Amino acid sequence: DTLQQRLQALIESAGENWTYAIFWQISHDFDSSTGDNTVILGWGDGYYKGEENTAEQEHRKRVIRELNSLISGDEEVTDTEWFFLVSMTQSFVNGVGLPGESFLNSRVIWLSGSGALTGSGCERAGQGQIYGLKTMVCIATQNGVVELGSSEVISQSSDLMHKVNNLFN
Numbered sequence: 001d002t003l004q005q006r007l008q009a010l011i012e013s014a015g016e017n018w019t020y021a022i023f024w025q026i027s028h029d030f031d032s033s034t035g036d037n038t039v040i041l042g043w044g045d046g047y048y049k050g051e052e053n054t055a056e057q058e059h060r061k062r063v064i065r066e067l068n069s070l071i072s073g074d075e076e077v078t079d080t081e082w083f084f085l086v087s088m089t090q091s092f093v094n095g096v097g098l099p100g101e102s103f104l105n106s107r108v109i110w111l112s113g114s115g116a117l118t119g120s121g122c123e124r125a126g127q128g129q130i131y132g133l134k135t136m137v138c139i140a141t142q143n144g145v146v147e148l149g150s151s152e153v154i155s156q157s158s159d160l161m162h163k164v165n166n167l168f169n
């Protein structure tokens, strides 16, 4: 039932070797100046597997808590472990980047191979590539976006769309 458990069930649910899964969670920001309400994607939770305003305040405190828990806690910090850490404080206006684009258009965005990551023009895909990712997939769901990443080239997953649906819709 927890985001973290669903994320975990998602990637240990066999198939290919995904390095991590993240859930980017919808929140809303009211801009008094414009009278606009903007959807913003922010860290919901994540599971790192490895290789082989009251809402605003709750969100920031939960992330700070999650950063604390992850860091504390003296050995090597790997490229993909770093990317995972670095992702926790990232956020995305709706329409912006791979997560914003997934959500805004109810898309799956599936990027398979280094060339796809840098080629997409998403700064986050680009960032992940720098850190040794070769596949990134973002799947819009009811309350945000599931992102899976792998240092392997993965261009197919039989079950993926079905599991994501059961676990997040």
Ligand SMILES: [Ca+2]
Pocket: 004, 045, 046, 066
């Ligand atoms: Ca967690």
Ligand SMILES: [Ca+2]
Pocket: 079
């Ligand atoms: Ca490096």
